[PDB]
Design an enzyme around this catalytic site. Structure first.
Site, PDB file in Angstrom:
ATOM      1  N   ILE A 131       0.862  -1.177   0.000  1.00 24.13           N
ATOM      2  CA  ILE A 131       0.000   0.000   0.000  1.00 24.13           C
ATOM      3  C   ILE A 131       0.908   1.239   0.000  1.00 24.13           C
ATOM      4  O   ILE A 131       1.829   1.336   0.822  1.00 24.13           O
ATOM      5  CB  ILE A 131      -0.931   0.032   1.259  1.00 24.13           C
ATOM      6  CG1 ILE A 131      -1.933  -1.128   1.202  1.00 24.13           C
ATOM      7  CG2 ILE A 131      -1.645   1.384   1.357  1.00 24.13           C
ATOM      8  CD1 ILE A 131      -3.097  -1.012   2.119  1.00 24.13           C
TER       9      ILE A 131
ATOM     10  N   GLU B 153      -2.187  -8.759   2.796  1.00 25.87           N
ATOM     11  CA  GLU B 153      -1.849 -10.029   3.410  1.00 25.87           C
ATOM     12  C   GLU B 153      -2.869 -11.095   3.065  1.00 25.87           C
ATOM     13  O   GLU B 153      -2.503 -12.241   2.810  1.00 25.87           O
ATOM     14  CB  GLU B 153      -1.711  -9.887   4.922  1.00 25.87           C
ATOM     15  CG  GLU B 153      -0.691  -8.822   5.327  1.00 25.87           C
ATOM     16  CD  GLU B 153       0.770  -9.199   5.073  1.00 25.87           C
ATOM     17  OE1 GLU B 153       1.071 -10.090   4.264  1.00 25.87           O
ATOM     18  OE2 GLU B 153       1.652  -8.538   5.649  1.00 25.87           O
TER      19      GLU B 153
ATOM     20  N   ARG C 280      -2.005 -12.376  -0.419  1.00 27.60           N
ATOM     21  CA  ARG C 280      -0.818 -13.227  -0.436  1.00 27.60           C
ATOM     22  C   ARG C 280      -1.082 -14.658   0.060  1.00 27.60           C
ATOM     23  O   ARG C 280      -0.413 -15.601  -0.380  1.00 27.60           O
ATOM     24  CB  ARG C 280       0.295 -12.581   0.411  1.00 27.60           C
ATOM     25  CG  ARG C 280       0.887 -11.295  -0.173  1.00 27.60           C
ATOM     26  CD  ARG C 280       1.633 -10.514   0.892  1.00 27.60           C
ATOM     27  NE  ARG C 280       2.164  -9.244   0.385  1.00 27.60           N
ATOM     28  CZ  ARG C 280       2.409  -8.171   1.142  1.00 27.60           C
ATOM     29  NH1 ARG C 280       2.164  -8.203   2.446  1.00 27.60           N
ATOM     30  NH2 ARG C 280       2.905  -7.064   0.600  1.00 27.60           N
TER      31      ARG C 280
HETATM   32  N1  LIG Z   1       3.973   0.309   2.038  1.00 26.80           N
HETATM   33  C1  LIG Z   1       3.801  -0.924   2.517  1.00 26.80           C
HETATM   34  N2  LIG Z   1       2.617  -1.541   2.461  1.00 26.80           N
HETATM   35  C2  LIG Z   1       2.432  -2.745   3.020  1.00 26.80           C
HETATM   36  N3  LIG Z   1       3.277  -3.451   3.753  1.00 26.80           N
HETATM   37  C3  LIG Z   1       4.481  -2.795   3.916  1.00 26.80           C
HETATM   38  C4  LIG Z   1       5.690  -3.192   4.586  1.00 26.80           C
HETATM   39  C5  LIG Z   1       5.949  -4.467   5.368  1.00 26.80           C
HETATM   40  O1  LIG Z   1       7.067  -5.251   4.836  1.00 26.80           O
HETATM   41  C6  LIG Z   1       6.778  -6.704   4.842  1.00 26.80           C
HETATM   42  C7  LIG Z   1       6.556  -7.317   3.408  1.00 26.80           C
HETATM   43  O2  LIG Z   1       6.072  -8.662   3.381  1.00 26.80           O
HETATM   44  C8  LIG Z   1       5.596  -6.723   5.834  1.00 26.80           C
HETATM   45  O3  LIG Z   1       6.109  -6.535   7.171  1.00 26.80           O
HETATM   46  C9  LIG Z   1       4.792  -5.498   5.246  1.00 26.80           C
HETATM   47  O4  LIG Z   1       3.584  -4.995   5.835  1.00 26.80           O
HETATM   48  N4  LIG Z   1       6.631  -2.274   4.361  1.00 26.80           N
HETATM   49  N5  LIG Z   1       6.091  -1.309   3.558  1.00 26.80           N
HETATM   50  C10 LIG Z   1       4.803  -1.619   3.242  1.00 26.80           C
END
Ligand SMILES: Nc1ncnc2c([C@@H]3O[C@H](CO)[C@@H](O)[C@H]3O)n[nH]c12
Length: 247
Positions: A71, A160, A163
């Site tokens: 996101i 999530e 995935r």
């Molecule tokens: N902009 C973003 N959107 C969603 N997840 C993340 C993350 C995180 O990095 C991991 C990728 O599987 C997990 O911890 C995820 O939520 N970093 N930046 C993100």
């Protein structure tokens, strides 16, 4: 774009939503019947909009990077909000361009930052469709101090769930109640990158991982996963992060 409406939502319509979200993501290969996401896409191909409407018919549009399902940010009316991270500032070049206000959030989208900001760990934040309704309201009427928790619900309910089939099912089940995620859900979230990498390796290594992945199962026991005949691979993980986005 993909749309989800919470009023009149059911387990079925959430599943439909999550199927369409996955279908929106481009993949060239499938390994072991799982979509392998692209390594690099031009800016005009890289982002997808998902529109979410809560019970009170308030809507936000969320921009996702289709190469990693991250996101980037969201729009509420005339204001856009982006995470404070490089890919999000790249995205802001392409999405929500007509928005009059743009705010950059004080944190990236990574869980360690978000949990710190929220002052709550993932295990203590309710999920379920009513939790998603509440997260949409909190972001719609942006309040800095509730935002982190709400963005964690948002990410887990979209990214999530896309995935992993197990996370999609656990969330979709809770239509009029909420639940606290087990360590099985959290370990899948933690391990997406490692699983993706090893599954790509396995395909060149007779289905064997080069390095085990330790997951926690529905009974809370630490399990060590070593190949593609494990259930997490056969029956759960629904998208693969390209090794070129692992670094
Ligand atoms: N902009 C973003 N959107 C969603 N997840 C993340 C993350 C995180 O990095 C991991 C990728 O599987 C997990 O911890 C995820 O939520 N970093 N930046 C993100």
């Amino acid at each position: 774009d993909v749309s989800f409406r919470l009023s009149g939502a059911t387990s079925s319509s959430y599943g439909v939503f999550i199927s369409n979200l996955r279908k929106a993501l481009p993949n060239e290969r499938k390994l072991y019947d799982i979509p392998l996401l692209r390594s690099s896409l031009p800016g005009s191909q890289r982002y997808a909009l998902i529109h979410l409407t809560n019970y009170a018919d308030e809507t936000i549009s969320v921009a996702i990077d289709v190469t990693n399902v991250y996101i980037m940010g969201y729009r509420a009316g005339d204001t856009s909000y982006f995470f404070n991270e490089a890919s999000a500032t790249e995205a802001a070049k392409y999405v929500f361009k007509d928005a009059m206000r743009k705010v950059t959030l004080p944190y990236s989208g990574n869980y360690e930052r978000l949990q710190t900001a929220a002052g709550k760990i993932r295990e203590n934040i309710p999920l379920g469709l009513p939790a998603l309704d509440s997260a949409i309201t909190t972001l719609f009427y942006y309040n800095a101090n509730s935002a982190a928790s709400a963005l964690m619900v948002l990410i887990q309910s979209t990214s999530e769930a896309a995935r992993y089939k197990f996370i999609e099912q656990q969330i979709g089940k809770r239509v009029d109640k909420t639940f606290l995620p087990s360590l099985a859900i959290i370990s899948l979230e933690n391990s997406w990158s490692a699983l993706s990498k090893q599954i790509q390796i396995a395909s060149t290594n007779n289905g064997q991982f080069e390095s085990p992945v330790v997951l926690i199962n529905a009974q809370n026991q630490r399990v060590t996963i070593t190949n593609v005949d494990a259930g997490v691979v056969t029956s759960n993980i629904a998208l693969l992060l390209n090794r070129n986005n692992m670094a």
